[PDB]
Amino acid sequence: ASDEEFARPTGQGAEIRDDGETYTTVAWNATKLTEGSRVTDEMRDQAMV
Amino acid sequence: ASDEEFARPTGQGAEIRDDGETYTTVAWNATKLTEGSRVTDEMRDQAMV
Ligand SMILES: [Mg+2]
Numbered sequence A, B: 001a002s003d004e005e006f007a008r009p010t011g012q013g014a015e016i017r018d019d020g021e022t023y024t025t026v027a028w029n030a031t032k033l034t035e036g037s038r039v040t041d042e043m044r045d046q047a048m049v
């Protein structure tokens, strides 16, 4: 969203004027982070941990 | 079928190699064994047996 502004000093019976929210955007591009580990079956079985 | 073999001493994490059951045949080829005998009608009549 656009930064906040201030409402306007207005006469009685006078038109309420427009200062609408103007918009922009920021892009995301999510990078894949990966880590693996390999263990032998013998190691997986024998570990105390 | 092929003969039994001995399983292979292997490292950990190493590929288990293929030595699958292997097959052959022995082909039979049945050979016609034949035997003939001929006798005349006079021989057949005159013989005691
Ligand atoms: Mg007007």
Ligand SMILES: [Mg+2]
Pocket (backbone or CB within 6 Å): A005, A019
């Ligand atoms: Mg403005």
Ligand SMILES: [Mg+2]
Pocket (backbone or CB within 6 Å): B005, B019
């Ligand atoms: Mg073999």
